[PDB]
Design a protein around this nucleic acid. Structure first.
Ligand SMILES: [Mg+2]
Ligand SMILES: [Mg+2]
Ligand SMILES: [Mg+2]
Ligand SMILES: [Mg+2]
Ligand SMILES: [Mg+2]
Ligand SMILES: [Mg+2]
Ligand SMILES: [Mg+2]
Ligand SMILES: [Mg+2]
Ligand SMILES: [Mg+2]
Ligand SMILES: [Mg+2]
Ligand SMILES: [Mg+2]
Ligand SMILES: [Mg+2]
Ligand SMILES: [Mg+2]
Ligand SMILES: [Mg+2]
Ligand SMILES: [Mg+2]
Ligand SMILES: [Mg+2]
Ligand SMILES: [Mg+2]
Ligand SMILES: [Mg+2]
Ligand SMILES: [Mg+2]
Ligand SMILES: [Mg+2]
Ligand SMILES: [Mg+2]
Ligand SMILES: [Mg+2]
Ligand SMILES: [Mg+2]
Ligand SMILES: [Mg+2]
Ligand SMILES: [Mg+2]
Ligand SMILES: [Mg+2]
Ligand SMILES: [Mg+2]
Ligand SMILES: [Mg+2]
Ligand SMILES: [Mg+2]
Ligand SMILES: [Mg+2]
Ligand SMILES: [Mg+2]
Ligand SMILES: [Mg+2]
Ligand SMILES: [Mg+2]
Ligand SMILES: [Mg+2]
Ligand SMILES: [Mg+2]
Ligand SMILES: [Mg+2]
Ligand SMILES: [Mg+2]
Ligand SMILES: [Mg+2]
Ligand SMILES: [Mg+2]
Ligand SMILES: [Mg+2]
Ligand SMILES: [Mg+2]
Ligand SMILES: [Mg+2]
Lengths: 208, 132, 328, 311
RNA sequence: UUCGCCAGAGUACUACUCGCAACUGCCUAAAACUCAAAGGACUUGGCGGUGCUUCACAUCCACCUAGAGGAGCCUGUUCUAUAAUCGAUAAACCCCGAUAGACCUUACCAACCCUUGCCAAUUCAGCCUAUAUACCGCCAUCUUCAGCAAACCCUAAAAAGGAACAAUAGUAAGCACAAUCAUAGCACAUAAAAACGUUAGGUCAAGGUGUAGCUUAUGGGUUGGAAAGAAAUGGGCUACAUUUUCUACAUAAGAAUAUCCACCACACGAAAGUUUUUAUGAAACUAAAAACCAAAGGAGGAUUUAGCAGUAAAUCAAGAA
């Protein structure tokens, strides 16, 4: 907010800048962009042009940080990706050739998958009518859903571990079980879905 | 509502001195300081004395020069001597003015044990900054 | 404790308490003192026959005398503050009705009226409802002005401070003047019966010895117009404003002898009782005097006011009517 | 008030001489530029508002313009539109409309703007209303809408103004060192209590030195090294350049960011004129305006307040 | 032109009469007594669990984060107790006047004492005594709200109102907002500012005063003594542990880790206490540090507080007295 409304966001992707020549409306557009003498924001410190940056991992990284510890959250995440990695190597070498073709060794694909699979389709909002609060079925916008998945994973592997158990480990377990849909996280997604199905009549109430 | 050193808006007829028309938040922005001395700078001593001293010279000049004082009284301290400037209204016949000049300078000089210099600038009527 | 004390003004603010003022700046000269020193530049001129008088001290008794002088000064000022109560009364006591407000203000064009008297007809405290303040108090005065020579008018004015409002009505009232046509420069021309908004005005044209018998307001207005002889009774609501509006409409409603003559093209002839049958002409029809006599009905058809006819036969028995009252 | 202007301009010149002779300059070439220096040295007011500082100026800049005498000594007014109460406005209007009419009988993005409302108010020496201004400008659009004559164009030029626009990241010419005969560029970034300076040598081993130690050791936090990597990975120069670095103030992330700015600044000598606008749109060369906000008294954290109690 | 109806308001579509297929009925219809009014229409406000539009940007809802209510402790009120201050006490009190009480401060209680008893002079001093609903001072509050207000002008009358921009009666300098200043260049942000009034809001204990009271005392001194907890509650601090605890250390380490079991107890948590020192000081009741001890607490009912970005949250250091 030390930025006036005059300052537009930085677009940080390099592939965009290096290879413009085949795109007309985008050539027009970024021409408008810098030609407008557009005051543009100092790019954040978390966003980098690193080839290794996955925005989803960043968000999930943040939401795990208590206080101001980037260092610590970064480390816990790193250890989670790592933990899943090694756990999947262990599953690989102890398996049969068919399953060697099957198994996912990429902790990243495992992560985007275990989140795609944990995200609820519909969710509830309370509506006040005639004195009572009814929980009613609301279709959700994607970002809210992503958030719900991540929030759930973090809250689940935060709360229910036995104290001798480190975060990255349990988190890895929950990731791999949510991968196969058998994990408690998905039990949660399902209790959402069931609660929505029971109240489906009340989907009349919602006016928007 | 800040009441500090302020002069309220009247029916609009009230005469106001440039100083009394500029509210406390304005010091060092438009208004200046009524006194000057070294004492409040970073490394400096005896600020308090020049404050008591100043106060007493406000009361003193208001009392020695009745009804003839125009605007608040401007003190300067330079290398141990006081330079006291006053805006003074013309009421008195000039003899009395010089009587009180000598009277003041002498009396003060012997009170504060440092040489005092006095200046009267005479004005026909209180300057009006606003309203009127 | 010299440090604890303050300026005079502050003390008077916090004495008076507006959230009478006496001044201590009055009577004391420079160098004036109780220990009685005569200072060469202040108490005494700087020089005598011999130059440069020295610093001198008066006697015990010379000081007792100067002190007596200041004491008698204060006494004089207190008496002068108490003697400040004097007034001329308008109608009754604290009623501002009929009070002389003093000639209106000279306009922008140098136009000056020293000839115009003003009288306050009605001063009234009026209130309003302001979200901020609760009640809000205005004063409204209805004021009339006239030179005695037949032109006069009135206006209303309203302000928070009543003084302000007296002023306002003055000036606004010079802006509305009527010319009021007087017969032989005292009465009205003919009787006027005029109903105006719930108030009835009725006025009979008197002969000369009969000064101004009227509602107190209408007396006031008729002294400002210069009408010296009138009978006027008022019916219905007496409220001041409707009354003066009514009266002014009515006295401008007047049909003059010249105009009567002109529309009827005949001579108009005053028959005095004191002068017997002598057929005094008042007005002549400039242009052609008609050769035509006018119908004399045994039976005229006119609105007749029951009050006048009741008067006529001796049927007004009210003990209030025939009263002696003070001069006009 | 005109007698005041005559008098004041006279005394202004007499005081002008008086100023020059004491200040000891030739009274002839004395300018306003010199007037300022003069008073500023004679009556040195530290004061923040600059209008309340001492002024000696030509009365015309001191005083407001005046509306001239509007009627002869007979009472009779000069301008025929006088009774409109704005003659100044409606004269412009009459003329404008006349111009238009004549154009209709005859006819059979440079950075130029119309006046502000305040500028038309200055031009006519007349208070204005928004509506009025709007009306007029509307009319000038009608004027531009048709075939444009010579005097037509001059006319609308009166109400024309021109504005500057400047955008380029200022390009430092490189600097070739005498010792190796080699070219370098020295940048300065500043972020949030932390300033950094970065000298970049155009022929590198990839070496990056910070305060006399290696960059890995000075930024054990990986995140920081990534921030550092940003400009170089952007311009694909990662091994090509050799940087020396001096940074001070603040904590680690602040430092890594200052080095980001300084480096990305020192990298625009060795880059192409085109990649510059990219680094702008990447937001590399723009400072971070974000800083700590002072606690406020009676509060907690500049924003955080003491817990509020309804009862 | 006629007829019928009205002489303050209640009392009273009532009490008594008269007449009626009514017999808690209809019709006709008073007075005692009480009051200085009772009524109609309007005017600005304010208000509305009326209707309609448009918003809320820490903000009501939905949403995000971190907490309060539970525990220990700190500290403030409220009550009980005391011979033993005052003031604040819905939003706008409650780590508040205090950026600060061992003596002092100090106004309090307990005893003793002194009477032109600070000053140049005064049948004069001195009063933290009663009035904040007499006040000036300083502020709170609506409020980051846009209005306040003189001077005029208009309204088949004016209590009051006064705009429509292809404009229909409004003009107006002033004070507000805005603008500029400060946060060392811009910009935004924050700071500041924010009238008129409102709450008889706060304060006669900062000081000063109007009115009242005290004058061998409601004045002035010396010596001690107060500030105990059955509770009840406001705000904080530290926790409840693995995103943790310890040591090294600055941000890659090594160990500990609530249950074994008879540990020779340990995991988190002692800010609390008991002991010893030390700092200050004439006087330790005060602060700090070690040694011991290790308790409640295992994430907290109804309900609530705060925050829109370098903010919230966490961490560290400095100053005022
Ligand atoms: Mg404020
Ligand atoms: Mg009387
Ligand atoms: Mg904070
Ligand atoms: Mg009756
Ligand atoms: Mg009935
Ligand atoms: Mg009956
Ligand atoms: Mg009958
Ligand atoms: Mg909130
Ligand atoms: Mg709100
Ligand atoms: Mg809690
Ligand atoms: Mg608690
Ligand atoms: Mg108390
Ligand atoms: Mg008690
Ligand atoms: Mg109390
Ligand atoms: Mg009170
Ligand atoms: Mg209060
Ligand atoms: Mg607090
Ligand atoms: Mg004590
Ligand atoms: Mg006492
Ligand atoms: Mg009381
Ligand atoms: Mg009050
Ligand atoms: Mg007050
Ligand atoms: Mg406005
Ligand atoms: Mg008005
Ligand atoms: Mg600036
Ligand atoms: Mg701003
Ligand atoms: Mg503020
Ligand atoms: Mg402002
Ligand atoms: Mg009160
Ligand atoms: Mg209250
Ligand atoms: Mg007092
Ligand atoms: Mg007193
Ligand atoms: Mg005593
Ligand atoms: Mg004591
Ligand atoms: Mg409790
Ligand atoms: Mg806490
Ligand atoms: Mg370790
Ligand atoms: Mg302890
Ligand atoms: Mg223990
Ligand atoms: Mg336990
Ligand atoms: Mg709530
Ligand atoms: Mg100190």
């Amino acid at each position: 907010s030390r930025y006036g409304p005059e300052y537009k966001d930085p677009q940080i992707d390099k592939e965009y800048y290096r290879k413009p020549l085949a795109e007309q409306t985008e050539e027009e557009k970024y021409e408008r962009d810098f030609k407008k003498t557009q005051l543009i924001k100092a790019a954040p410190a978390t966003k980098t042009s690193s080839v290794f940056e996955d925005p989803v991992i960043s968000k999930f990284t943040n939401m795990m940080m208590k206080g101001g510890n980037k260092v610590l959250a970064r480390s816990l995440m790193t250890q989670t990706l790592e933990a899943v990695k090694r756990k999947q190597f262990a599953k690989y070498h102890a398996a049969s050739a068919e399953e060697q073709a099957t198994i996912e060794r990429n902790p990243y694909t495992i992560f985007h998958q275990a989140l795609k699979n944990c995200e609820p389709v519909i969710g509830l909002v309370p509506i006040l009518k005639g004195g009572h609060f009814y929980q009613v079925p609301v279709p959700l916008a994607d970002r809210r859903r992503r958030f719900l998945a991540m929030k759930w994973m973090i809250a689940e592997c935060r709360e229910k571990k036995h104290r001798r158990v480190l975060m990255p480990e349990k988190l890895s377990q929950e990731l791999l079980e949510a991968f196969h849909n058998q994990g408690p996280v998905i039990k949660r997604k399902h209790d959402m879905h069931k609660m929505a199905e029971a109240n489906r009549a009340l989907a009349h109430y919602r006016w928007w | 509502k800040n009441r500090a050193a302020r002069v309220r808006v009247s029916k609009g007829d009230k005469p106001v001195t440039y100083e009394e028309a500029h509210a406390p938040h304005y010091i060092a922005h438009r208004k200046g300081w009524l006194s000057l001395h070294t004492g409040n700078l970073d490394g400096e001593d005896h600020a308090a004395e020049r404050t008591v001293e100043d106060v007493f010279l406000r009361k003193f000049m208001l009392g020695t020069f009745p009804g003839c004082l125009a605007d608040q009284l401007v003190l300067k301290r330079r290398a141990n001597q006081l330079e006291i400037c006053a805006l003074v209204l013309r009421q008195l016949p000039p003899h009395k003015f010089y009587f009180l000049v000598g009277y003041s300078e002498t009396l003060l000089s012997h009170f504060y044990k440092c040489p005092v210099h006095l200046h009267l600038q005479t004005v026909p009527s209180k300057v009006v900054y606003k309203y009127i | 404790s010299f440090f604890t004390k303050l300026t005079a003004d502050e003390l008077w603010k916090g004495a008076l308490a507006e959230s009478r003022r006496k001044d201590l700046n009055r009577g004391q000269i420079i160098g004036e003192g109780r220990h009685g020193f005569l200072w060469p530049g202040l108490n005494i001129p700087l020089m005598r026959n011999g130059a440069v008088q020295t610093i001198a001290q008066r006697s015990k008794e010379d000081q007792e005398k100067v002190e007596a002088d200041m004491v008698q000064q204060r006494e004089e000022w207190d008496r002068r503050r108490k003697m400040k109560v004097k007034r001329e009364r308008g109608w009754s006591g604290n009623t501002w009705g009929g009070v002389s407000l003093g000639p209106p203000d000279p306009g922008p064009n140098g136009e000056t009226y020293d000839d115009f008297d003003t009288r306050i007809l009605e001063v009234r405290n009026v209130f309003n409802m302001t979200a901020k303040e609760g009640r809000k108090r205005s004063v409204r005065v209805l004021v009339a002005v006239g030179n005695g020579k037949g032109a006069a008018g009135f206006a209303i004015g309203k302000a928070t401070e009543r003084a302000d409002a007296f002023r306002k009505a003055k000036n606004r009232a010079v802006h509305y003047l009527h010319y009021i046509e007087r017969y032989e420069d005292h009465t009205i021309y003919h009787d006027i019966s005029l109903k105006f908004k719930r108030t009835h005005i009725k006025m009979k044209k008197q002969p000369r010895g009969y000064g101004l018998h009227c509602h107190r307001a209408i007396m006031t207005i008729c002294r400002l117009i210069g009408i010296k002889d009138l009978y006027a009774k008022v019916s219905g609501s007496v409220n001041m404003l409707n009354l003066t509006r009514g009266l002014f409409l009515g006295l401008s409603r007047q049909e003059t002898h010249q105009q009567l003559a002109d529309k009827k093209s005949l001579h108009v002839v005053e028959f005095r009782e004191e002068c017997g049958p002598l057929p005094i002409v008042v007005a002549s029809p400039q242009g052609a005097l008609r050769k035509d006599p006018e119908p004399e009905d045994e039976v005229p058809d006119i609105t007749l006011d029951w009050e006048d006819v009741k008067a006529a036969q001796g049927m007004k028995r009210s003990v209030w009517s025939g009263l002696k009252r003070a001069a006009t | 008030t005109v007698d005041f202007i005559k008098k004041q301009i006279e005394e202004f010149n007499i005081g002008k001489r008086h100023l020059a002779n004491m200040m000891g300059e030739d009274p002839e070439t004395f300018t306003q530029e010199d007037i300022d220096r003069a008073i500023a040295y004679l009556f040195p007011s530290g004061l923040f508002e600059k209008r309340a500082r001492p002024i000696m100026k030509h009365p015309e800049e001191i005083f407001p313009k005046q509306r001239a005498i509007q009627w002869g000594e007979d009472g009779r007014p000069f301008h025929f539109l006088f009774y409109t109460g704005k003659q100044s406005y409606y004269s412009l209007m009459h003329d404008t409309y006349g111009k238009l009419l004549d154009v209709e009988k005859h006819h059979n993005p440079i950075g130029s703007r119309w006046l502000i409302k305040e500028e038309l108010e200055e031009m006519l020496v007349e208070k204005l209303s928004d509506q009025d201004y709007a009306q007029f400008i509307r009319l000038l659009e009608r004027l531009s809408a048709l075939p444009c004559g010579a005097t037509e164009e001059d006319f609308v030029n009166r109400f024309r103004r021109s504005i500057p626009x400047x955008x380029x990241x200022x390009x430092x010419x490189x600097x070739x060192x005498x010792x190796x005969g080699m070219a370098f560029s020295r940048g300065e970034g500043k972020r949030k209590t932390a300033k950094a300076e970065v000298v970049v040598y155009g022929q590198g081993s990839g070496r990056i030195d910070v305060n006399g130690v290696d960059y890995l050791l000075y930024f054990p936090v990986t995140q920081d090294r990534e921030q550092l990597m940003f400009p170089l990975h952007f311009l694909d120069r990662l091994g090509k350049h050799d940087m020396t670095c001096a940074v001070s103030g603040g904590g680690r992330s602040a430092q890594a960011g200052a080095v980001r700015l300084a480096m990305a600044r020192a990298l625009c000598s060795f880059v192409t004129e085109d990649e510059v606008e990219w680094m702008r749109q990447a937001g590399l060369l723009t400072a971070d305006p974000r800083v700590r906000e002072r606690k406020k008294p009676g509060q907690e954290g500049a924003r955080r307040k003491f817990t509020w109690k309804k009862r």
